[PDB]
Write a protein that holds these residues in place. Structure first.
Motif, PDB file in Angstrom:
ATOM      1  N   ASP A  55      40.640  36.258  35.086  1.00 20.19           N
ATOM      2  CA  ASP A  55      41.098  37.689  35.271  1.00 20.19           C
ATOM      3  C   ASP A  55      40.980  38.007  36.840  1.00 20.19           C
ATOM      4  OD1 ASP A  55      41.801  38.046  32.527  1.00 20.19           O
ATOM      5  OD2 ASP A  55      40.313  38.918  31.973  1.00 20.19           O
ATOM      6  N   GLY A  56      39.567  37.805  37.524  1.00 22.24           N
ATOM      7  CA  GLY A  56      39.415  37.993  38.546  1.00 22.24           C
ATOM      8  C   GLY A  56      40.418  37.326  39.472  1.00 22.24           C
ATOM      9  N   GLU A  57      40.836  36.045  39.431  1.00 25.31           N
ATOM     10  CA  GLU A  57      41.836  35.504  40.111  1.00 25.31           C
ATOM     11  C   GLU A  57      43.042  36.214  40.157  1.00 25.31           C
ATOM     12  OE1 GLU A  57      41.714  31.087  39.333  1.00 25.31           O
ATOM     13  OE2 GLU A  57      39.418  31.092  39.551  1.00 25.31           O
ATOM     14  N   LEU A  58      43.341  36.484  38.885  1.00 24.35           N
ATOM     15  CA  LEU A  58      44.696  37.518  38.976  1.00 24.35           C
ATOM     16  C   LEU A  58      44.596  38.918  39.480  1.00 24.35           C
ATOM     17  CD1 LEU A  58      47.070  37.906  35.767  1.00 24.35           C
ATOM     18  CD2 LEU A  58      46.047  40.169  36.859  1.00 24.35           C
ATOM     19  N   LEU A  59      43.507  39.472  39.400  1.00 18.28           N
ATOM     20  CA  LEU A  59      43.156  40.760  40.353  1.00 18.28           C
ATOM     21  C   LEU A  59      43.419  40.485  41.752  1.00 18.28           C
ATOM     22  CD1 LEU A  59      42.398  43.729  40.736  1.00 18.28           C
ATOM     23  CD2 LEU A  59      39.824  42.714  40.459  1.00 18.28           C
ATOM     24  N   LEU A  60      42.883  39.270  42.253  1.00 17.41           N
ATOM     25  CA  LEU A  60      43.089  39.147  43.726  1.00 17.41           C
ATOM     26  C   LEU A  60      44.448  38.918  44.114  1.00 17.41           C
ATOM     27  CD1 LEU A  60      39.819  37.175  44.560  1.00 17.41           C
ATOM     28  CD2 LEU A  60      40.451  39.380  45.411  1.00 17.41           C
ATOM     29  N   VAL A  61      45.218  38.212  43.260  1.00 10.22           N
ATOM     30  CA  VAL A  61      46.982  37.828  43.478  1.00 10.22           C
ATOM     31  C   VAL A  61      47.509  39.144  43.257  1.00 10.22           C
ATOM     32  CG1 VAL A  61      46.477  35.808  41.920  1.00 10.22           C
ATOM     33  CG2 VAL A  61      48.803  37.022  42.199  1.00 10.22           C
ATOM     34  N   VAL A 100      31.763  41.067  40.455  1.00  8.44           N
ATOM     35  CA  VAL A 100      31.710  42.525  40.100  1.00  8.44           C
ATOM     36  C   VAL A 100      32.707  42.438  38.798  1.00  8.44           C
ATOM     37  CG1 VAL A 100      32.862  44.796  40.855  1.00  8.44           C
ATOM     38  CG2 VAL A 100      32.230  42.922  42.774  1.00  8.44           C
ATOM     39  N   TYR A 101      32.049  43.573  38.115  1.00 10.77           N
ATOM     40  CA  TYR A 101      32.620  43.920  36.581  1.00 10.77           C
ATOM     41  C   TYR A 101      33.226  45.190  36.644  1.00 10.77           C
ATOM     42  CZ  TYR A 101      33.833  43.676  31.764  1.00 10.77           C
ATOM     43  OH  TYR A 101      34.610  43.892  30.771  1.00 10.77           O
ATOM     44  N   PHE A 102      34.407  45.315  36.862  1.00 11.28           N
ATOM     45  CA  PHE A 102      35.307  46.587  36.757  1.00 11.28           C
ATOM     46  C   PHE A 102      35.278  46.832  35.263  1.00 11.28           C
ATOM     47  CE2 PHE A 102      36.693  44.573  40.730  1.00 11.28           C
ATOM     48  CZ  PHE A 102      36.317  45.800  41.539  1.00 11.28           C
TER      49      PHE A 102
END
Ligand code: NA
Lengths: 152, 138
Positions: B120-126, B107-109
């Motif tokens: 950045d996606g890994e950061l988003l999930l944390v 998914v690209y927000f």
């Protein structure tokens, strides 16, 4: 000056069978950890039993007075009570070039990862606010003021 | 016979009128133009739920349709405007991002500039996990 002034913010557990989150254990952990780095000097250790209340606020005032360059805290969930407060206090520190280091998440709030944290929290907080607003409007409609079930 | 990258767009659309830049047809145009810029990409579909602008009052049928198409192997990535215009809350954002990620569907927000398959996606999930934990603990 010279040395980086380092504080820690702690949430203290209400028992006991959890010695790792006791005040004394956390005081020793942070004192020893911050002493590992000779470029740093311990400002203070701040702790409330449980953003969070009195010692958190003392920490914020010491930050506004220039006593602290970086604050350690174990997690976002211990730092503040909700998304809006997390934003408020992270931004207030950031405007004064004061970093928070979230240990579990591994984020220093002054990095580009810190900037992404704030972007994500802003989007989360906007949705939470709109959700409250929607729920309030739905709740009002649930109230029966037309004699639906019971007459006047 | 290797297919183009199959791109879906998820949108909350407005029927107002006073907000035609958020209309179904404006969105179709936007994502049509984006995908035209990239010869290696193809529209899977536009997924659009009617919603009131500036609110979380939204339909969910097309969001569900999109999730089904993702689980059925039809979609390689999803563009969507914002975290606040995708799933309805933090726990659902986590649920759906993880489900897609498990299938290596990005998914690209767009507003946040976050691709969920990157660091950045890994950061988003944390950060979202922390927000959820923060609710539980406070
Ligand atoms: Na194309």
């Amino acid at each position: 000056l010279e040395r980086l002034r380092v504080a820690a913010y702690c949430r203290v557990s209400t028992d006991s069978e959890d010695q790792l989150n006791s005040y004394k254990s956390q005081v020793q952990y942070y004192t020893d950890m911050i002493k590992k780095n000779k470029e740093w000097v311990l400002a203070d250790i701040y702790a409330d039993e449980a953003t969070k209340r009195e010692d958190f606020q003392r920490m914020i005032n010491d930050c506004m007075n220039g006593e602290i360059d970086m604050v350690f805290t174990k997690s976002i969930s211990r730092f503040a009570r909700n998304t809006l407060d997390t934003l408020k206090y992270v931004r207030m520190l950031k405007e004064r070039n004061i970093a928070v280091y979230f240990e579990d998440e591994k984020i220093n709030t002054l990095t580009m990862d810190g900037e992404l944290l704030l972007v994500v929290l802003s989007s989360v907080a906007q949705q939470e606010v709109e959700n409250i607003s929607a729920n309030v409007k739905k709740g009002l409609k649930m109230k029966m003021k037309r004699g639906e079930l019971v007459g006047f």
